[PDB]
Every structure is written in C-alpha cells, then in structure tokens.
Design a protein around this ligand. Structure first.
Ligand SMILES: C=C(C)CCOP(=O)(O)OP(=O)(O)O
Ligand SMILES: CC(C)=CCSP(=O)(O)OP(=O)(O)O
Ligand SMILES: [Mg+2]
Ligand SMILES: [Mg+2]
Lengths: 248, 279, 295, 248
C-alpha cells in the first residue's frame, strides 16, 4: 500500500500547490472544494504507475495525472446535480465550476512543457489529444449518457458492462496509455497498457455498481480480472506484479 | 473601399463548412445531435473571424487557424447552452429556436456542452497543421486560460453570485464584463496571432485590441438599453459612458495601426460596428 | 476409456469463451445486445463441437477451426431467432428465456439475426489464421452453400410451405429433414475437415457421415418435442401437434421413430469405421450424445 | 447515360445466368422474384465503374457487383416485412428468402476465384470482409435500425441524413472500394473512391427520403454533391468525368 498511497498523495500535493484559493474567493472557493471533494480516481494513479513501470520519472506524468483527475472531477459534479443530497454550492455555481475545472487541466499540461527537454512538445500534444478524447463524446460522455437508460432491476449486465467500459474504462486506458507515452515507452507497450487500463477501469466501474445491481454475476468480475492480466504478460517490473493488484 | 458585409459572409461560410465537417452525427446520436443543434444554428461567427483575421493579419493563412477558430466557436456555443439552463437564466428560446435543454432534456444539454468543451481541445490539437508542436501547445494553453477560472467561467460565476445584491460596485461590474465577454475575444485573437507566426509584441497589441472591443461591446449595450441591476449609466451617467465607449474604440484601432491597413480593415470595421450599432 | 462428458464440457467452455469474445457490445447497443442475448444464451453447441472435432480428426488443431466453429453457431442462432418469430413458429420460449422478439421486439429481432449471418462470414474471413487464403475462401463458399437455397434455408421454406396441407408426402419430408437440420451439420463437419487439411476423400466421407447424424438430429428433436416439456427442452414444445406439421412420430409413432433413430446412429458410426478408432472417438461420442441427449 | 445502362444490364445478365429457377420451385421461385423485384442499386454499378476507373476490367468485379446487389435486395425484402399489402409472397417465405439471398452472394464471390490469377485469393478475401461489414450491424443494419426512430415531421435532417449514411452510404462506399480493390488500385485510390461512395450513396438515400420528409434543405443535397466531387479530384479518366456526372 505505501506505493499506491504515496502516488495519490503526490498527486494531491501537486493539485494543492496548483489550485490556490484567492480573490475572487467566490470563484476559487468552489474550484478548490469541488476538485477535492470528488473521489480520487484510479485513472490518475495508473498514469504515474505506468510511467514508472516503463522507466520514466513520476514527475514526467504529474500534470497528466492531475489533468485526468480534474476531468473526472468535473464530470462527477455535473452528474450529481440535481439535488440528490447536500451541496456546499448552488446548481449554477457547480455547473460553471465543472466548466472551469476541465480547462485548468489542459492549462497545467501546456504549462509543463520544459523547453530544455527537446521531447516535451510532442509527447504533451499527444497526451492532450488522448485526454481530450477519453473525456469527450466518444468516451466518458458516451457512458454518462447511456447511464440514463439504466433501470435498477431491468437492464442487463451486458448493457451495464458497456456503460462501465465508457464511463470508467476509456478513462483508465487513457491514463495508462498517457503514462506510457510520457515515459517514452514503445507503441507496443503503450497499446498493452492502454488495454490493461481499459479492463481495469471497466472492472473498477462494475464495483461502483455492485452496490445497486446485485445481479452482478461473479463470472463477469472474473472475465475482466482475467482479461486484465492476460494483458500484462510480456511485461515485467514490480509494477508488472504490482500492477496486477486491483485484479485480486 | 472595404466591403465588410461581404467579408463577414465569406468567413462565416468558411467557418460553417468546417464546423459542419468537424462535428458529425455518430453514436451516441443524441449527444451529437444536441451538439449540432446548437453549434451549427448559425451566428455572426465573430469569434472564429477574429481568430482567422488575427492570423492573416500577422501573415499566417486561414487553413492554419481554422481548427482554433472552430474551437473557440464550440466553447462559445457550450457557454450559451449552459447559460440557458433552468439553474441559470432558465430561458425557453435562443438564436431563433427552442433552447437545447427544451429540445433534448437537461441531461443531454449539459453533456453535449461538456462534449463541446473537450472536443475543442482535441480538435485544435489533432487537426492543426502547418504549425510546430510547441506552438500548438502554447495555443492550447492560451485557450485554457481564457475560458476557465481567470476567464469566461470566472466571469459567469461572479455574475451569478451578484444577482443577490441589488446594489453593485463599478469595478465588480467591469470584472464581470472583462471575463464574461472579453476573455474569449482575446483568446480568439491570440490563438490566431500565435498560429500565424506573430511576433510577441504583435500578439500583445492584439490582446489589448481584444480587451477593448470586448469591454466596448458591454458598455454600448448598457448605453442602448437606457437611451432607447447595475450598469455604466447608473454609475457614471450616459455622457461619461459614451465618452468611455469612444475611448475604448479609439484605443482598439490604435492597437491595429501597427498592421497593414488593408489586413486590418475587417477588425477596424468590426470595432466601429460594435461602437455605433443601432442595436 | 473415452470420457465424453468431460470432453463436451471442455469444448463447450472453449467455444463459449470464443463466442463471447467475438460478439462484443458496441453501438448500436440494442442490435448487439439482442445478438448476444441469443448467442450466449447457451445451447448444446453441438455444431461448433462437430466442426472442431472434424478438424482435429484429420490432423488440424482447434485454434484454426475456432472462428469457423463460432460462425456456424452464429448462423445456427440466427435461424432460431428467425424461426421463433410471429410469422414463423410464433414461439415465446427459447433456450430458457423469452424469445428474442419478445425481449426486443420484432424488428431488432430480424436485424440482430441478419447481423449474425453477416458477421459469421466476416468473422471466418478475417480471423482464421493458420490456413492459406484459397483455403479460407473455399471454406466460406462451403458455408454459403450449406446455409442458403440448397441448404438450411431451402429446408425452412419447404417446411413452411408444407404446413398448408394435412396431405403429407413421404419424401417432401425427407427433403425437409436433409435440408432443415442435416445441411448445417455437414457444413460444420466440412469446414473443419477442410481447415484441418483433410484430403478430399476424408471430406467426402465426413460429409456422408454428417448426413446421417443430421437426419438423426431432427428425428431425435421430433421425439423430445412430444415427450418432454418446455421447461426441460428450454423451448416451447409439443406445438408439432397443434400445427399441421409433419414429424416422424406423427407419421410413424414414437417407437418406430426411436427405432429409426438407433438405426441412424448405427449407420453413422459405421461410416466412421473409415478412420482409426482412436481418431474417431470424439465423433462417435458426439454421434451418441446427439442420439441420447435429454434435451 | 448509355454507359451506366450497359453496366446495369451486364450485372443483370450475370445474375440471370447465376440465379436459375430449378426444382424445388417453391424455394428458387421466390429467390428469383425477390432478387429482381428489388430496385437496382448504384452501389453495384459503382463497383464496376470503379474497377474500370482504376485500370481493371469489368469482368474483374462482376461477382462483387452481384454480391452487392443481393445484399441490398435481402435488406429491402426484410425492410418490408408486415402484411402491409398483398405481396406476391407470404411473410415467412420472404423473410427466409432474404436469408437465402445473402449467402448466395458469398457463394458467387468464392466460386469466382481464378487460380490462374495469382492475386485473386487475397483480393477476394478482402472483398468478402468489406461486403460482410457494410452489410453488417455497423453498416446498413445500423441504418435499418435507426430508421425505426423517425417521426417524419418531427425528426431533424441531421438524424435523417445519418440514417442515410448508414442505410445507403456504407454500401456505396463498399461498392466503390471493392471495385478499386478488384482492379488492383493502390490504398490511396481505394480510400478516395470509398469516400466518394459514401457521399454519393448518402445523397442518393436523400432522394428516396425526399418522397415523404420533404423539408430537406436543398443545401444538404448541395454539400453532399460538393463533398463527393472534392473527392473525385486527383483522379483522371473517362469514368472520372462520368462518375462526376453521377453527382452533378
Ligand atoms: C432441431 C433443430 C433443427 C434446431 C435446434 O437446434 P439445437 O437443439 O441444437 O438447440 P441449441 O442447443 O442451440 O439451443
Ligand atoms: C433448422 C432451423 C433453421 C430451425 C429449427 S426448425 P424447428 O422449429 O423444428 O425447431 P425448434 O423446435 O423450434 O427448435
Ligand atoms: Mg419451425
Ligand atoms: Mg420452432
């Protein structure tokens, strides 16, 4: 656990020295509170792990991991208006703050281009494309949208699994993929991590939905774990046996 | 003598043709249909024009700025989509038809607008050609800063949190106008100036220009309403506000003197139009 | 000793693992959902196993025959989806659950079915590995022929055009049995025999062999219908009585029909005396299961 | 247009020598009737025109053009499956015949391998892949399916135009691309004609949807023609003038 917890904390610290509450407090108060009230996401974590699994420096993926957390954060806020529970801020301030969170993710990335590293520009452009895609209409939004069609004890597992593949999967694959890219890995190893990511997040999403749909056949969590690990073969490093953690 | 009308028509047609191509129908059909419903509704297309014009002003050409011109239009669309929602202005009509949530449901409208925002970055980053990677990355960063917490959004949030107090100050009002309207005009002009290879001091001059017409627009709107809630006429009177208008207009055009008067014609025509508009 | 049970257990599992992998959920979600609803609902998977067994018999191995094994099962599944429709048998139960058109409506049922038919060819043509192109095209052609106007379909059309009259020709009936069920069993056996590299005479002998267990298959199915309940069969049963539809039990009772079954199974196994008894064991076990299955 | 009519007739003659009514009449009668009562499709002609426009001979893509027509005939028969009017054949026989037409199409292709042409096996395999896909769940079926969601004077032109891209477009793109393949064109050429076909077929589909939902903005016909030609440039030949006619 120390490894994963210390990755999450590095990401929190970084977001914290980046998102500083200040006048106009009416704007950064909500930007700060909504960003840290959103559950953390394994897609950010997976970003740093993959980066390190392929040889690169955690610091090479921090902005990407931060950015993925923010994109996830905004979608979460937008998901949870209507007033289901208790909000610190009104529906309008939250809608508008989600709209400000995603852009800040891209700002962080663009501002991280070290100009003494000949290779930054290209890798970062690529990552911006991957993160904007995973978060757009063909990825996550595709999933937030089909979610609407679910009916507690009526809709099938097959359907639920696909909502999980779009809502969470696409974002985990983007995370592992981006870590690979920031780390300088080869196309072959990016593809593998991307796939690994996809399953892991699909599975992670099936759990967030275990708590409602109790129909979840133990065989589905099994086919995913298995598809995940099949993916990590050919690859090695402790993260090659530590990556196989959230499939146990 | 520069035909501004025709000019505006050529650019709009170019932009609409590219927006149409960039945002196509595909699953999920409803998220995509909601995006098109608002994005291709047609408009003056002032922001994509400013982007393209700024790029041709410094010597670059249209095809290089097009994705960024498309991007700023998408962000402007998403801002209107959100503003029309029930938890905001709660409007039933916009730009000639039922609002997006009325036509597709609140949930689809929120998501479609989110889809627009992120696709703006995907599109500028993957489709821009004729520019080096760090240049494209600098631009994505400029787009970011102009739409977020120190831009468009901060303007909207400070506005919404001001609807409580019937009484308001002048520099609170100017803060709303600069972030609400000007920030995205500046972003538009800068993505283009930077994509066309503009030198840093040409960029700076275009930024000033963008802030003035931006501010100028709001100040004129406030004047029209009155000479036909806090506003310029109430804080400093109509005479002084009109004065202020001419001063912003004057400062905008001063910024453009650096450029070929022939390339600047549209931007000068535009500043003068925002200033003497009958409505 | 040959442990048939364990064997079918192992091949079934492999085929179900490949099937689920081949047809994934993707947009349009309903077409794909309805395809997976019927395809992974799970049946005996006799055809996929006939295909793999035939490939392994002539020396080939399972993984070169798997996309073809999947393809015949998809074609089989689409013929049930179409067969169950209101304009056909108008049945409400299949494979333990509501028929497709009851779960998704008529239209998604027709379409989901045609998609399976299409994907069967795409799947064999793009995923088969370990065989040369001329071979894969030959196999696709045999699949075509077994399922269309000279095959499955011909048997189905003639069958619905025979429910018009109670006046039942003795061999307007064999024509229906050889095309309605035998044709696709032969197709399964041949795709795998050819894929495994079987020589022409081996292929021809397997073809003749599939024709016997194919005629057998339908005979046993006609028996179970009038001797089993819907819950047991997983499908609406006994409707052969409430439909002027000629089956063997109707034409010669159940005892002469069972008698005819063993005669068919014996002839089936006689045909495999062609191959070494060791190579033959899976097919023989499969001939017996097709003959004594309880469902 | 003399040239097209001849292409039309050559396709018809081949079909005619291929689909022979033989006993059992009860099966081949309907197979013959439905196959020719189906409106002809430019997807089939496009196939030969594209083969000739790239350098091969018409005979090089007859089987594909024929298989293309059959796929569209079955979808047509399956599109009209109620007792809406007294059709010449009952609903079960028509549904079954449709199921018998599709495979016959793959039978023609298969049996059309000339072992004298070294490169046939591969060209034909790929044509079977392209044809089974355009006809599959992601192509024409996508279209037949969403067509159901239309409420004439209530659904947008964007929705109508996408059903037209899936229902007619995809098959036309397939025809054009299969001809390029059969005529040994190069990958750049194929993609171009492919795209040419998608626009052409969508626009054509807009003609058969004009006969009811007539609020078709004439600029939707406009952009499609225009996108079609912007596609044909870079190509030269008689058919390059002739294909161009198919749209302007
Ligand atoms: C008797 C015929 C012609 C078809 C039913 O086949 P099956 O009985 O093989 O059923 P499944 O196991 O696939 O469900
Ligand atoms: C052979 C084909 C295509 C379908 C099965 S014919 P059938 O209706 O006798 O069989 P079922 O009882 O419905 O299983
Ligand atoms: Mg039947
Ligand atoms: Mg039946």
């Amino acid at each position: 656990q120390p490894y994963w917890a210390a990755i999450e904390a590095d990401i929190e610290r970084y977001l914290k020295k980046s998102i500083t509450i200040r006048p106009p407090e009416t704007v950064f108060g909500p930007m700060h509170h909504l960003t840290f009230a959103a559950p953390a996401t394994a897609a950010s974590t997976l970003c740093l792990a993959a980066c390190e699994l392929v040889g690169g420096d955690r610091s090479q993926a921090m902005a990407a991991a931060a950015a993925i957390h923010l994109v996830h954060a905004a979608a979460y806020v937008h998901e949870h208006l209507p007033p289901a529970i208790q909000h610190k801020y009104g529906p309008n301030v939250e809608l508008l703050t989600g709209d400000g969170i995603v852009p800040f993710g891209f700002e962080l990335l663009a501002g991280s281009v070290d100009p003494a590293r000949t290779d930054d520009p290209d890798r970062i452009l690529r990552v911006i494309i991957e993160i904007s895609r995973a978060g757009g209409p063909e990825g996550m939004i595709s999933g937030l949208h089909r979610e609407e069609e679910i009916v507690d004890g009526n809709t099938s597992l097959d359907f639920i699994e696909y909502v999980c593949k779009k809502k969470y999967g696409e974002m985990h694959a983007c995370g592992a993929a981006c870590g690979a890219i920031l780390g300088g890995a080869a196309e072959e190893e990016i593809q593998k991590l991307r796939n690994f990511g996809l399953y892991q997040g699909t599975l992670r999403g099936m759990m967030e939905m275990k708590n409602s749909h109790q129909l979840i056949d133990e065989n589905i969590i099994g086919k995913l774990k298995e598809l995940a690990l099949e993916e990590l073969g050919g690859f090695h490093g402790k993260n090659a046996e530590l990556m196989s953690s959230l499939v146990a | 003598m520069f035909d501004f009308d025709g000019y505006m028509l050529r650019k709009a047609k170019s932009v609409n043709k590219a927006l149409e191509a960039a945002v196509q129908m595909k699953e999920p059909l409803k998220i995509h249909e909601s995006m098109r419903y608002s994005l291709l509704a047609g408009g003056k297309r002032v922001r994509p024009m400013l982007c393209i014009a700024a790029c041709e002003l410094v010597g670059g050409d249209e095809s290089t700025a097009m994705p960024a011109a498309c991007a700023v239009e998408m962000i402007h669309t998403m801002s209107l989509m959100h503003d029309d929602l029930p938890c905001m202005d709660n409007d039933d009509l916009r730009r000639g038809k039922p609002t997006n949530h009325m036509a597709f449901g609140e949930s689809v409208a929120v998501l479609a607008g989110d889809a627009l925002l992120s696709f703006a970055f995907e599109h500028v980053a993957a489709a821009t050609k004729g520019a080096p990677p760090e240049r494209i990355v600098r631009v994505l960063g400029e787009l970011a800063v102009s739409i977020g917490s120190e831009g468009l959004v901060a303007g909207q949030v400070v506005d919404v949190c001001s609807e409580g107090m019937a009484e308001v100050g002048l520099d609170h009002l100017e803060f709303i106008h600069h972030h609400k309207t000007a920030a995205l005009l500046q972003g538009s002009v800068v993505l283009g100036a930077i994509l066309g290879g503009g030198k840093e001091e040409e960029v700076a001059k275009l930024r000033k220009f963008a802030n003035c017409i931006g501010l100028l627009f709001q100040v004129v709107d406030d004047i029209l309403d009155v000479t036909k809630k806090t506003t310029y006429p109430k804080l400093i009177g109509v005479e002084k506000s009109k004065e202020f208008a001419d001063r912003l207009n004057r400062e905008a055009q001063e910024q453009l003197l650096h450029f070929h008067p022939h390339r600047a014609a549209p931007l000068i025509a535009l500043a003068n139009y925002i200033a003497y508009r009958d409505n």
